[PDB]
Amino acid sequence: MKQIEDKIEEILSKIYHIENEIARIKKLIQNVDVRSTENAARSRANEQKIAENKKAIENKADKADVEKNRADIAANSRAIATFRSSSQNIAALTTKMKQIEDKIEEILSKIYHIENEIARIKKLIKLH
Amino acid sequence: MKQIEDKIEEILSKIYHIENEIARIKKLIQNVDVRSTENAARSRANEQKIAENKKAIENKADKADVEKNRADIAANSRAIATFRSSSQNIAALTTKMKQIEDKIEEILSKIYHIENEIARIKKLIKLH
Amino acid sequence: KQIEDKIEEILSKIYHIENEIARIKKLIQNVDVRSTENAARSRANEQKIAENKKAIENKADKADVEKNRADIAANSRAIATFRSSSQNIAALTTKMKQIEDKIEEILSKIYHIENEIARIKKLIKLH
Ligand SMILES: [Cl-]
Ligand SMILES: [Cl-]
Ligand SMILES: [Cl-]
Ligand SMILES: [Cl-]
Ligand SMILES: [Cl-]
């Protein structure tokens, strides 16, 4: 009788409450199902950006290569101070050379004066 | 007894529906769980791979150092063609030199013949 | 009889269902959170990737360093040649020295000659 109509009253109340929870549950699963797929795309985007970075790195030059170069550069820099000295030796060998040419033209002229004297002397002596 | 029966029927239909909805929820839920654990695995791997790239990046050369080297190299190259006309000046000095060497020996040769002819003049004088 | 027995069943199915729902709620909640973590982790990763992309925009390519390496080995090959030349300076310096010497040899021979001649000029005027 009414014990039944109370169990039924309880049974309906539970059922209605169960229905609200399911609706609310379904909603939540939709919220999370959508996020997890936006995450799956966000992470497949990233792993492909990273394979680009991995690649774009296989292209950038080592640091050891560029520290060899800065050594070999400073090596050649120093060799330029070893063979910058023998530039001012040229400007010194040209002025001395020139001096030597001047003295040589002066020596020649003395010889030609001398030769003229000796021509004179050989004549004076045969004229006796 | 035929209102208690109508409500009971309403419940049996409602229960069957709720059961069917719960089966939908479970497998749906399962899949979001399955997918979210992938996304987690994917995002931590990517984390590892991002790290790897951060290190590799650290072993590559900063452009500014490579740009230094370029400039230094060019300024070395500047002061190297600069010392090509140094040796241009040499080839003139070497020839100008051998022109002086050939003179000096001729000068000597005229001088030796002068000496001889003086020795002659002197001997000619004493005998008179 | 036959009402009481359906109601009995119904109450057992409700209880069964209440457990399924309370189990479902913590599954969902767990998965919700795991996805909120996944979401931030993947947003962070994209920020880190985006620091690596910006650190790649401050490094030199292989081509440019390869170039520098060639430019250098040239300047080594170009110098080394020129280095062999400039030993020809040392040759002019000592040869100039020998000359300087031969000239002072010559200059002094001449002065002794001038002297002899000065005497001869006089001796011939003395006849
Ligand atoms: Cl997720
Ligand atoms: Cl370099
Ligand atoms: Cl260099
Ligand atoms: Cl990610
Ligand atoms: Cl990266």
Side-chain angles (χ1 to χ4, degrees), chain A residues 36-37 39-47 49-53 55-65:
Chain A
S36 83
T37 320
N39 295 346
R42 188 149 40 210
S43 36
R44 283 157 164 144
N46 287 357
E47 100 210 21
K49 278 154 159 196
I50 293 153
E52 244 60 59
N53 284 352
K55 188 74 105 277
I57 288 159
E58 297 154 26
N59 211 338
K60 300 319 198 161
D62 266 72
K63 209 180 290 183
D65 285 325

Short mmCIF file of all heavy atoms in Angstrom, two decimals, chain A residues 36-65, unseen atoms left out:
data_model
loop_
_atom_site.label_atom_id
_atom_site.label_comp_id
_atom_site.label_asym_id
_atom_site.label_seq_id
_atom_site.Cartn_x
_atom_site.Cartn_y
_atom_site.Cartn_z
N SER A 36 41.28 17.55 -24.84
CA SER A 36 42.31 16.53 -25.12
C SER A 36 42.66 16.42 -26.61
O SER A 36 43.79 16.03 -26.95
CB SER A 36 41.94 15.15 -24.55
OG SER A 36 41.07 14.45 -25.40
N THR A 37 41.71 16.76 -27.49
CA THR A 37 41.96 16.77 -28.93
C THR A 37 42.67 18.06 -29.36
O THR A 37 43.46 18.05 -30.31
CB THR A 37 40.66 16.58 -29.75
OG1 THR A 37 39.83 15.59 -29.13
CG2 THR A 37 40.99 16.12 -31.16
N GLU A 38 42.39 19.17 -28.68
CA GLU A 38 43.13 20.42 -28.91
C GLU A 38 44.57 20.30 -28.39
O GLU A 38 45.46 20.96 -28.91
CB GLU A 38 42.43 21.63 -28.26
N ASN A 39 44.76 19.50 -27.34
CA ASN A 39 46.10 19.15 -26.85
C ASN A 39 46.88 18.23 -27.79
O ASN A 39 48.10 18.37 -27.90
CB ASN A 39 46.04 18.47 -25.48
CG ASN A 39 45.52 19.39 -24.39
OD1 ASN A 39 45.45 20.60 -24.58
ND2 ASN A 39 45.16 18.82 -23.25
N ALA A 40 46.18 17.29 -28.42
CA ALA A 40 46.80 16.33 -29.37
C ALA A 40 47.30 17.04 -30.63
O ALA A 40 48.30 16.62 -31.24
CB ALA A 40 45.82 15.23 -29.76
N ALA A 41 46.58 18.08 -31.03
CA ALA A 41 46.99 18.91 -32.15
C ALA A 41 48.10 19.88 -31.73
O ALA A 41 49.01 20.14 -32.51
CB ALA A 41 45.79 19.69 -32.68
N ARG A 42 48.02 20.42 -30.52
CA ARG A 42 49.03 21.34 -30.01
C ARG A 42 50.38 20.66 -29.81
O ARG A 42 51.43 21.31 -29.97
CB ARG A 42 48.56 21.97 -28.70
CG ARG A 42 49.44 23.09 -28.15
CD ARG A 42 48.61 24.12 -27.39
NE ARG A 42 47.57 23.48 -26.57
CZ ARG A 42 46.40 24.02 -26.26
NH1 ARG A 42 46.06 25.23 -26.68
NH2 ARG A 42 45.54 23.33 -25.51
N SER A 43 50.37 19.36 -29.51
CA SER A 43 51.60 18.60 -29.30
C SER A 43 52.18 18.01 -30.59
O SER A 43 53.40 17.85 -30.72
CB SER A 43 51.42 17.51 -28.23
OG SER A 43 50.14 16.92 -28.25
N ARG A 44 51.33 17.72 -31.56
CA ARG A 44 51.80 17.32 -32.89
C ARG A 44 52.33 18.53 -33.67
O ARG A 44 53.24 18.39 -34.49
CB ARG A 44 50.72 16.59 -33.67
CG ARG A 44 50.56 15.16 -33.20
CD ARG A 44 49.19 14.60 -33.53
NE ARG A 44 49.22 13.15 -33.41
CZ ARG A 44 48.23 12.38 -32.96
NH1 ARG A 44 47.08 12.91 -32.57
NH2 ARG A 44 48.42 11.07 -32.90
N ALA A 45 51.76 19.70 -33.41
CA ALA A 45 52.34 20.95 -33.90
C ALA A 45 53.76 21.11 -33.36
O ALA A 45 54.70 21.34 -34.13
CB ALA A 45 51.48 22.14 -33.49
N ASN A 46 53.90 20.98 -32.04
CA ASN A 46 55.18 21.15 -31.37
C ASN A 46 56.26 20.17 -31.81
O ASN A 46 57.39 20.58 -32.08
CB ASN A 46 55.00 21.08 -29.85
CG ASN A 46 54.34 22.32 -29.29
OD1 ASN A 46 54.06 23.26 -30.01
ND2 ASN A 46 54.08 22.33 -27.99
N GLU A 47 55.92 18.88 -31.92
CA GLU A 47 56.94 17.88 -32.29
C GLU A 47 57.49 18.09 -33.71
O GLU A 47 58.59 17.63 -34.02
CB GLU A 47 56.42 16.45 -32.11
CG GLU A 47 55.94 15.76 -33.38
CD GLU A 47 54.83 14.75 -33.14
OE1 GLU A 47 54.16 14.85 -32.10
OE2 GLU A 47 54.62 13.88 -34.00
N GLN A 48 56.70 18.77 -34.55
CA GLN A 48 57.09 19.11 -35.91
C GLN A 48 57.88 20.41 -35.96
O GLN A 48 58.75 20.58 -36.81
CB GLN A 48 55.87 19.21 -36.83
N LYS A 49 57.57 21.34 -35.05
CA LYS A 49 58.40 22.53 -34.85
C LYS A 49 59.78 22.15 -34.35
O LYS A 49 60.77 22.73 -34.77
CB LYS A 49 57.78 23.51 -33.87
CG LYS A 49 56.72 24.41 -34.46
CD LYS A 49 55.75 24.83 -33.37
CE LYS A 49 54.98 26.08 -33.71
NZ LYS A 49 54.39 26.63 -32.46
N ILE A 50 59.82 21.17 -33.44
CA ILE A 50 61.06 20.66 -32.87
C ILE A 50 61.93 19.92 -33.90
O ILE A 50 63.16 20.03 -33.87
CB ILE A 50 60.76 19.76 -31.65
CG1 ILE A 50 60.18 20.61 -30.51
CG2 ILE A 50 62.01 19.05 -31.15
CD1 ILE A 50 59.28 19.85 -29.57
N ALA A 51 61.31 19.19 -34.82
CA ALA A 51 62.06 18.52 -35.92
C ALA A 51 62.62 19.54 -36.92
O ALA A 51 63.62 19.28 -37.59
CB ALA A 51 61.19 17.50 -36.63
N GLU A 52 61.95 20.68 -37.03
CA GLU A 52 62.48 21.83 -37.76
C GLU A 52 63.71 22.39 -37.05
O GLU A 52 64.74 22.64 -37.68
CB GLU A 52 61.41 22.93 -37.92
CG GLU A 52 61.00 23.22 -39.35
CD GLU A 52 60.40 22.02 -40.06
OE1 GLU A 52 59.38 21.48 -39.58
OE2 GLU A 52 60.95 21.63 -41.11
N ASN A 53 63.59 22.61 -35.74
CA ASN A 53 64.72 23.09 -34.94
C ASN A 53 65.89 22.13 -34.96
O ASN A 53 67.04 22.54 -35.09
CB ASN A 53 64.29 23.38 -33.49
CG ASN A 53 63.51 24.67 -33.34
OD1 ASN A 53 63.40 25.45 -34.28
ND2 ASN A 53 62.97 24.91 -32.15
N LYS A 54 65.61 20.84 -34.82
CA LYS A 54 66.66 19.82 -34.88
C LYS A 54 67.39 19.93 -36.21
O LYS A 54 68.63 19.84 -36.26
CB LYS A 54 66.08 18.42 -34.69
N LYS A 55 66.63 20.14 -37.28
CA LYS A 55 67.18 20.27 -38.64
C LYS A 55 67.95 21.58 -38.80
O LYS A 55 69.12 21.57 -39.20
CB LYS A 55 66.04 20.17 -39.67
CG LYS A 55 66.48 20.09 -41.13
CD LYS A 55 67.07 18.73 -41.52
CE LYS A 55 66.12 17.88 -42.36
NZ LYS A 55 65.13 17.13 -41.53
N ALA A 56 67.32 22.71 -38.45
CA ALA A 56 67.93 24.04 -38.60
C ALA A 56 69.19 24.23 -37.77
O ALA A 56 69.98 25.15 -38.00
CB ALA A 56 66.92 25.13 -38.25
N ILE A 57 69.37 23.36 -36.78
CA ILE A 57 70.60 23.31 -36.01
C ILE A 57 71.70 22.58 -36.81
O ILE A 57 72.86 23.00 -36.77
CB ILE A 57 70.34 22.68 -34.62
CG1 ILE A 57 69.56 23.67 -33.75
CG2 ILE A 57 71.64 22.30 -33.92
CD1 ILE A 57 68.84 23.01 -32.59
N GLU A 58 71.34 21.52 -37.54
CA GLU A 58 72.30 20.73 -38.35
C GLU A 58 72.79 21.50 -39.57
O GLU A 58 72.78 21.00 -40.71
CB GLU A 58 71.65 19.43 -38.84
CG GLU A 58 71.23 18.44 -37.77
CD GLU A 58 70.10 17.53 -38.23
OE1 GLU A 58 69.97 17.31 -39.46
OE2 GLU A 58 69.33 17.04 -37.36
N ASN A 59 73.27 22.71 -39.33
CA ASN A 59 73.39 23.73 -40.37
C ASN A 59 74.17 24.90 -39.79
O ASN A 59 75.06 25.46 -40.43
CB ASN A 59 71.99 24.19 -40.81
CG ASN A 59 71.94 24.62 -42.26
OD1 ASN A 59 72.95 24.98 -42.87
ND2 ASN A 59 70.73 24.59 -42.82
N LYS A 60 73.82 25.25 -38.57
CA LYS A 60 74.60 26.18 -37.79
C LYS A 60 76.01 25.61 -37.53
O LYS A 60 76.18 24.41 -37.30
CB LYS A 60 73.87 26.50 -36.48
CG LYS A 60 72.49 27.12 -36.67
CD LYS A 60 72.51 28.15 -37.78
CE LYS A 60 71.32 29.09 -37.73
NZ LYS A 60 71.58 30.33 -38.51
N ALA A 61 77.01 26.49 -37.59
CA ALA A 61 78.41 26.07 -37.54
C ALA A 61 78.86 25.86 -36.12
O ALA A 61 78.42 26.59 -35.22
CB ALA A 61 79.29 27.12 -38.21
N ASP A 62 79.74 24.89 -35.92
CA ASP A 62 80.33 24.63 -34.61
C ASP A 62 81.09 25.83 -34.06
O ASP A 62 81.44 26.76 -34.80
CB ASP A 62 81.26 23.41 -34.63
CG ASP A 62 80.56 22.12 -34.22
OD1 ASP A 62 79.73 21.61 -35.00
OD2 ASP A 62 80.84 21.63 -33.10
N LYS A 63 81.33 25.79 -32.76
CA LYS A 63 82.11 26.80 -32.04
C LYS A 63 83.61 26.50 -32.16
O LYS A 63 84.44 27.42 -32.15
CB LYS A 63 81.70 26.83 -30.57
CG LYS A 63 81.87 28.17 -29.88
CD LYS A 63 81.46 28.13 -28.41
CE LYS A 63 79.95 27.98 -28.24
NZ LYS A 63 79.52 28.00 -26.81
N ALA A 64 83.94 25.21 -32.26
CA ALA A 64 85.33 24.77 -32.39
C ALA A 64 85.91 25.13 -33.76
O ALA A 64 87.09 25.42 -33.87
CB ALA A 64 85.44 23.26 -32.16
N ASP A 65 85.06 25.09 -34.79
CA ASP A 65 85.45 25.53 -36.13
C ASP A 65 85.80 27.02 -36.14
O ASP A 65 86.80 27.41 -36.72
CB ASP A 65 84.32 25.26 -37.15
CG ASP A 65 84.19 23.78 -37.53
OD1 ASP A 65 85.22 23.06 -37.60
OD2 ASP A 65 83.05 23.33 -37.78
#
